[PDB]
Amino acid sequence: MGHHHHHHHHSGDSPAVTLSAGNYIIYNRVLSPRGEKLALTYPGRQRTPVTVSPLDGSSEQAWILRSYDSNSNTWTISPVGSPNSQIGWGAGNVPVVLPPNNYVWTLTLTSGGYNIQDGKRTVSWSLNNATAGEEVSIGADATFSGRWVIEKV
Ligand SMILES: CO[C@@H]1O[C@H](CO)[C@@H](O[C@@H]2O[C@H](CO)[C@@H](O)[C@H](O)[C@H]2NC(C)=O)[C@H](O[C@@H]2O[C@@H](C)[C@@H](O)[C@@H](O)[C@@H]2O)[C@H]1NC(C)=O
> DSSP states of the chain as a string?
----SSS--STTTS------SEEEEEEETT--TTSS-EEEE--SSSSSB-EEEE----TTT-EEEEE--SSS-EEEEEETT-TTSEEEE-SSSSEEEE--SS--EEEEEETTEEEEE-TTSS-EEE-SS-STTPBPEEES--TTTS-EEEEE-
Closest CA to 130 of 48, 26, 31, 42: 31
Distance 1 CA to ligand 1 centre (A): 37
**Protein residue with its CA nearest to atom 18 in ligand 1:** 91
Give the separation between CA 21 and CA 12, rounded to whole angstroms. Answer: 26
Distance 35 CA to ligand 1 centre (A): 36
Name the experiment that determined this structure.
NMR
Distance 88 CA to ligand 1 centre (A): 8
Distance 92 CA to ligand 1 centre (A): 13
3-class SS string, 34-61: CCCCEEEECCCCCCCECEEEECCCCCCC
Q: What residue segments make up the domains of the chain, in order of their start?
A: 18-153
| 102 Cβ closer than 6 Å to some ligand 1 atom | yes
Distance 105 CA to ligand 1 centre (A): 9
- Which residue among 78, 98, 103 has the greatest number of ligand 1 atoms within 8 angstroms of its CB, and so is best to mutate? 103
Closest CA to 126 of 106, 148, 146: 146
18-153: what CATH class?
mainly beta
- In sequence order, the 6+-apart residues with CB closer than 8 A to the CB of 2 are none
| 94 Cβ closer than 6 Å to some ligand 1 atom | no
| 104 Cβ closer than 6 Å to some ligand 1 atom | yes
